[PDB]
Amino acid sequence: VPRGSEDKWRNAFDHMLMEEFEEKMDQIEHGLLMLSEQYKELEKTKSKELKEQILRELTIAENYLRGALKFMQQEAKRTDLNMFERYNFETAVSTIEILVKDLAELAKKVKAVKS
Amino acid sequence: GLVPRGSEDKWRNAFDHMLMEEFEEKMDQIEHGLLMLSEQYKELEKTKSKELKEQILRELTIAENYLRGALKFMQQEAKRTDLNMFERYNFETAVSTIEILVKDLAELAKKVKAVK
């Protein structure tokens, strides 16, 4: 890929990694949606085990997302990015930030269940 | 909430399971990419193309950054206080696998930089 293109991934690892990130992102979103459903069950049952297990899964997703965030922020700062690339890294950052926010919202709710 | 906290033979957490499968796939991909870059290093040896050299370095640098991140992450998971045997085995193996890949990357980088 010429260094001069502005409309594509110029590096093969960049493309491969975005692609790994996006799949991971949709999976996490889906897991969060499943945990929301489980929070609704928790609301009714008050099961200490469900509560604990939801908290554990939220903590692992959070850790992973904090890791991806750090990685993507750094990539966004690169000095050699074309517009396409910088856009993509910046959008990944925002997407992670929203997911982290949603996790933390759900965590608050779960902790608040009186089991 | 399903898997009992006393299982020793399986992932007890859904996100652990999900991310680890996703990690193994990625490792194989990175391995294949390193293999492709080695091939390209051989071409570089003959042609001495500055652009090929620069591009291989760039890709190596991106793969290294990603692998050092994954290494930090996996080391940390391996230090969890609540792991069963199956989980610890998996995290610890992931850590070793990442280390080997990082070493291979760095070896390839040395060779590339040495192309005049």
Residue numbers in the entry:
A (entry chain A): 3 to 117
B (entry chain B): 1 to 116
Paper text:
Among these, group 21 allergens including Blo t 217, Der p 218 and Der f 219 identified in B. tropicalis, D. pteronyssinus and D. farinae, respectively, are known as mid-tier allergens in the allergic response. The structure of rDer f 21 adopts a bundle of three anti-parallel α-helices similar to the group 21 HDM allergen Blo t 2116, and group 5 HDM allergens including Blo t 514,15 and Der p 512. The crystal structure of rDer f 21 revealed an elongated dimer structure with molecules A and B interacting in a head-to-toe orientation. Helices α1 and α2 form an intermolecular anti-parallel dimeric interface while the C-terminal α-helix (α3) is fully exposed to the solvent.
The structures of rDer f 21 were obtained from two different crystal forms grown using either PEG 400 or PEG 2000 MME as a precipitant. The similar dimeric form of rDer f 21 protein crystal structure grown from the solution containing PEG 2000 MME, rDer f 21PEG2KMME, was solved to 2.3 Å resolution. Although the rDer f 21 protein structure crystallized with PEG 2K MME as a precipitant neither shows the helical distortion nor binds a molecule of PEG 2K MME, some unidentified weak electron density was also observed in the cavity. Furthermore, knowing that only PEG 400 but not PEG 2K MME can fit within the cavity, we further deduce that a molecule of a size similar to PEG400 may exist as a physiologically active molecule for Der f 21.
